[PDB]
Amino acid sequence: IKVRENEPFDVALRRFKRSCEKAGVLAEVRRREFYEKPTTERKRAKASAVK
Amino acid sequence: SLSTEATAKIVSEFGRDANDTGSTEVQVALLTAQINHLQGHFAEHKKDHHSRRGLLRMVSQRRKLLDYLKRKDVARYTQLIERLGLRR
Amino acid sequence: MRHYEIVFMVHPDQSEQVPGMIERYTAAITGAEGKIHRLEDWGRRQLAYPINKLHKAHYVLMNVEAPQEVIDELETTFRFNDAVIRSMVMRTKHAVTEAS
């Protein structure tokens, strides 16, 4: 949302613009409510990746 | 559940010796006490199949122990039936 | 007979009647053979969200061992008292370092 910062800024930016979890949870809340197999698919992929 | 003090009274009343919590009379008496409590539990709303499975398990294990008591010694079996009011 | 932890928040405008509140509730509890372990009046406290369009509420915690019947009628009194805006009755929450 927003974290406490000093009112004068060197330049007007947001620190966590592209890292916000809001966009991802909005994309998952919109449609496609499977939620059963992707946990196992993610776990098998993660176990393959970790060596 | 069966209370500790009720369980101790059952083992002291139906036990041929003290600390005989394992005798067949004591096991059948404890099982009957839980049957009589669970009947009042299952009077209300009667949809608890999961607890009813444990209830039917107490019934079945009681039947096996009473059949064992029949084959081993019939005098004790008839006395236990007369004490707990079953198989009328 | 049974250990319980009771926390209730009171509307800020009704803050004058909370010592009488805890006195009558403790009296009912002690009449029902209960023992009060830690009667702590937390006092007024800002709330993280508004409930019933109020922002600051009185708080008091009781931590009583008592029978289930007196705790259920206590819960009824909490539901029917309009000063209590929310009340929670927990499980044993046994004897630990008091005043937490």
């Binding site: 949302i1 007007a12 947001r14 809001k22 966009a23 909005l26 809340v29 919109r30 449609r31 | - | -």
Partner: protein
């Protein structure tokens, strides 16, 4: 001009269209502009430039009131969020707060199953 001179810009950046509404702190709307009304329709509506034109249009819409500082309330997953914010500080209003007010439910109502293909 207006005496309070403080406002909030609500950026409803949906996937198709971005609506920018500058209101006061009490919620009463002073002005609004949209990506469809900015002159871009169809595929260009979703693009970040359309939201920039929407922000500039609402900026000149509330230039009558003399808004000096505006907090920013951002809703939605659309491409127009950061573009609308940038176009507001380009329009020269001081941005005092940037809050992400997207309605994130709890497990909530059932989502639409549509667009499955």
């Amino acid at each position: 001009r207006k005496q309070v001179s403080d406002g909030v810009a609500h950026i409803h950046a949906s996937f198709n269209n971005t609506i920018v509404t500058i209101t006061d702190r009490q919620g009463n709307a002073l002005g609004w502009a949209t990506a469809g009304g900015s002159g871009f329709r169809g595929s260009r509506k979703s693009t970040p430039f359309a939201a920039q034109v929407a922000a500039e249009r609402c900026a000149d819409a509330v230039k009558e009131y003399g808004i000096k500082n505006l907090e920013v309330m951002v809703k939605g997953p659309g491409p127009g969020r950061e573009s609308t914010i940038r176009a507001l500080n380009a329009a020269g209003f001081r941005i005092t707060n940037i809050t992400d007010v997207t309605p994130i439910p709890h497990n909530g109502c059932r989502p639409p199953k549509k667009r499955r293909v």
